[PDB]
């Protein structure tokens, strides 16, 4: 652990040329070639201090940069007094800030900087956390500010943790918890909260982030005696209880998450008094129990059926419950990744598609070949809106196959337009095709792709 490893975690290490946040060209560990606009000057500039390849151990660049950063710190009348007074580690944090914005920007934190010189660690950390700097990159800033406040690398040891065999073993054990244990054993395993109303007693609760962890393949921390565990417009507040998920609600949500809506319509219209689709409190219980085969909490039951518990649920209203709940769960599952400016890695989106197909690393093995550019939430949710119609989409794909048309990107994008009434962005197709062609031609293994997508869609199996 040192500045190299620190600044390798905050600024990722990139082998090929790119542009940092502002316009300028950059390669390496945050190493700016030149501010010119031409890529060609960058390559030719890059080679003037490397000697003609746009490529790993040629990380002397980070080493010369730090030396220039230290040096620029030291001829600077505002950065130098502070740096000289800091120990080996806090110096690394300040070099880190200089890396991120250069000495002129750093040197503009004149009170925090002045605090670090008077060794007021907690003050400078409270004050620094208040700034745009932190607002723009809050995770980097918290590590830097910890490293300022405590004098230790503890902020980074936690993230330095990438060994695959010990960690896989717990992935594998946990996957079996989800797939084979009872709901009571699953709920108790992943729930993190406890609520103590002495009137009555202690009951375990789940935060939304716990709940999505329950159901997505691939431990008590807090007690509650009006907190908010869920985003401003979140289906979970209908459950009451601050956005927490009780056990009864865990049963209910996992049922309605992975049932196709046609089945709920047919279920509603069957047990409905008049078969039009409007089901009362009691008739609702047999519906959701019947659906389970193929004790709802008092907050929800009033939300649907009114506080007298005598209202009725419209298949139209409930169907929007389901549609809304499916959204927020997809949101939560999207953010369980690395949402850098609201885009996850290409390699991780691939991990959403195969999260329910078990030992399918073999497919992803050849997927990292091609790869860059993140994928927005809207890109993803559109694919997951595409999967809603997968039985209709599998029909179309087989036809285009027998008629001899190839199953390349235009076909898939056309099929998603025609039968799924949604537009699949270009990039998510490249990701989807790199994973499932499996042979290198831009042609999908349609029968195989439809098999894994049938398990993603319903979080089930085969």
């Amino acid at each position: 652990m040192n500045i190299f490893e620190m600044l390798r975690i905050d600024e990722g290490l990139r082998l090929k040329i790119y542009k940092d946040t502002e316009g300028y060209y950059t390669i390496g560990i945050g190493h700016l070639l030149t501010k010119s606009p031409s890529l060609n000057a960058a390559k030719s500039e890059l080679d003037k201090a490397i000697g003609n390849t746009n490529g790993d151990e040629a990380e002397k660049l980070f080493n010369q940069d730090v030396d220039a950063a230290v040096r620029g710190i030291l001829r600077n009348a505002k950065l130098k007094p502070v740096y000289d007074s800091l120990d080996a580690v806090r110096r690394a944090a300040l070099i880190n800030m200089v890396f991120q914005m250069g000495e002129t920007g750093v040197a503009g934190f004149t009170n925090s900087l002045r605090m670090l010189q008077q060794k007021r660690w907690d003050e400078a950390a409270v004050n620094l956390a208040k700034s745009r700097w932190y607002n723009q990159t809050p995770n980097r800033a918290k590590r830097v500010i910890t490293t300022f406040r405590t004098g230790t690398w503890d902020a980074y040891h936690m993230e330095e943790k990438k060994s695959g065999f010990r960690d896989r073993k717990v992935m594998e054990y946990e996957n079996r918890i989800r797939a084979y244990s009872t709901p009571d054993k699953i709920f108790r395993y992943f729930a993190t909260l406890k609520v103590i109303s002495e009137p009555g007693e202690a009951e375990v609760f789940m935060t939304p982030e716990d709940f999505v962890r329950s159901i997505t393949p691939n431990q008590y921390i807090i007690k509650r005696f009006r907190e908010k565990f869920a985003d401003e417009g979140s289906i979970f507040y209908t459950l009451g209880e601050c956005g927490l998920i009780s056990f009864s609600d865990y049963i209910f949500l996992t049922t309605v998450l992975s049932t196709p809506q046609r089945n709920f319509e047919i279920a509603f219209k069957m047990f409905d008094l008049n078969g039009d689709g409007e089901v009362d409190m009691e008739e609702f219980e047999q519906v959701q129990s019947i659906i389970r085969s193929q004790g709802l909490c008092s907050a929800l039951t009033t939300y649907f059926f009114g506080a007298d518990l005598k209202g009725k649920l419209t298949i139209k209203n409930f169907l929007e419950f389901q549609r809304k709940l499916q959204h927020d769960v997809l949101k939560l599952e999207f953010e369980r990744h690395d949402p850098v400016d609201g885009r996850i890695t290409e390699r991780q989106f691939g991990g959403m598609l195969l999260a329910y197909s078990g030992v399918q690393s073999k497919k992803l093995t050849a997927m990292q070949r091609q790869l860059g550019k993140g994928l927005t939430f809207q890109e993803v949710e559109n694919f997951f809106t595409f999967l809603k119609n997968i039985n209709d989409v599998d029909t179309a794909l087989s036809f285009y196959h027998m008629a001899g048309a190839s199953l390349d990107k235009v076909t898939m994008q056309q099929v998603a337009r025609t039968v799924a009434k949604v537009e699949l962005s270009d990039h998510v197709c490249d990701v989807v095709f790199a994973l499932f062609d499996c042979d290198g031609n831009g042609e999908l293994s349609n029968k195989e792709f439809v098999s894994i997508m049938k398990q993603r869609l319903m979080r089930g199996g085969s």
């Binding site: 069957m270 078969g275 019947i290 179309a396 036809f399 027998m402 048309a405 025609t418």
Partner: protein, 308 residues
């Protein structure tokens, strides 16, 4: 493949070692598994082609298109398969298939993409006498769809109107075959229809109920009958609503059956059909219908004995 045995069982013409069907053939092969007097194959004359053009211009374009043609017509083996699929699974999303060979996105196809359109829908005796191989003969469907010269185009609207009319023609035609010519099916005649392709292990109870337990009532009219047929096509939404009654450990009585129908098809059945279906398939007499068995007979009748 039983369909090649059906085609060959009823085909009445040979041309170039390739066998053909006439609309009269095609009808008989849809409602019968074998006929008492086999047909006479004759070598395809040159009058027939002259006649295949005549019948197109004088034949009902409605739900009598095949009865009017009759022996004036031609249906290749590839066409026959295509027509059978329309009648045994009318819901193979022909729309999306029609829309993939869509030309210029106007939802219509040209004669060239015809052979493909039959091929993608209908696919997934007489080895070489029956195969996908391309033809040089102008068949009745091709003349009607895209014109004699082939220069017309086929809009999906016309093609949906053609599948519906084809279904309607078999229903109208089977009505009279099984009603013995009278204008009202008997409850007993409806049963003979329903159980024509049923050869499973419980046919002794079904048929015993027909004879003993179901011989008096208000007779079944054509539109009462068609409405049952149009129900049998929607049976999978029915099958689901039935399963949910089992998982509810609920016996399916009449009032339940009436409900499963309105959800599956949006329409309700005559009282005399409901009564017939129950009297046949209420094996125990507990006024509770054996839906799993009633559902098996429906599949026999929908599949028309070709294993569809």
């Amino acid at each position: 493949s039983l369909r090649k045995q059906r085609f060959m069982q009823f085909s009445s013409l040979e041309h170039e070692g390739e066998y053909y069907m006439t609309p009269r053939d095609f009808l008989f092969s849809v409602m019968f598994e074998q006929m008492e007097r086999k047909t006479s194959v004759k070598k395809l004359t040159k009058k027939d082609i002259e006649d295949t053009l005549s019948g197109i211009q004088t034949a009902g374009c409605g739900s009598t298109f095949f009865r009017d043609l009759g022996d004036k017509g031609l249906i290749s083996y590839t066409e026959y398969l295509f027509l059978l699929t329309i009648l045994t699974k009318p819901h193979s999303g022909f729309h999306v298939a029609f829309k993939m060979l869509d030309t210029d996105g106007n939802e219509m196809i040209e004669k060239r993409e015809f052979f493909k359109l039959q091929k993608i829908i209908s696919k997934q005796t007489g080895y070489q006498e029956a195969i996908v191989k391309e033809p040089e003969i102008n068949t009745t469907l091709q003349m009607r769809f895209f014109g004699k010269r082939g220069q017309r185009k086929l809009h999906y609207k016309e093609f949906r109107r053609f599948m519906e009319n084809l279904q309607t023609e078999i229903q109208e035609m089977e009505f009279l075959q099984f009603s013995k010519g009278l204008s009202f099916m008997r409850k007993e005649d409806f049963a003979e229809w329903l159980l024509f392709f049923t050869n499973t292990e419980n046919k002794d109870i079904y048929w015993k109920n027909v004879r003993e337990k179901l011989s008096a009532g208000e007779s079944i009219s054509l539109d009462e009958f068609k409405s049952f047929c149009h129900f049998t096509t929607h049976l999978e939404d029915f099958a689901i609503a039935m399963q949910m009654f089992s998982l509810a450990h609920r016996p399916v009585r009449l009032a339940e059956f009436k409900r499963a129908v309105k959800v599956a098809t949006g329409q309700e059945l005559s009282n005399n059909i409901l009564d017939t279906v129950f009297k046949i398939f209420d094996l125990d007499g507990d006024e509770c219908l054996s839906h799993e068995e009633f559902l098996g007979v429906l599949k026999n009748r929908m599949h028309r004995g070709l294993w569809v």
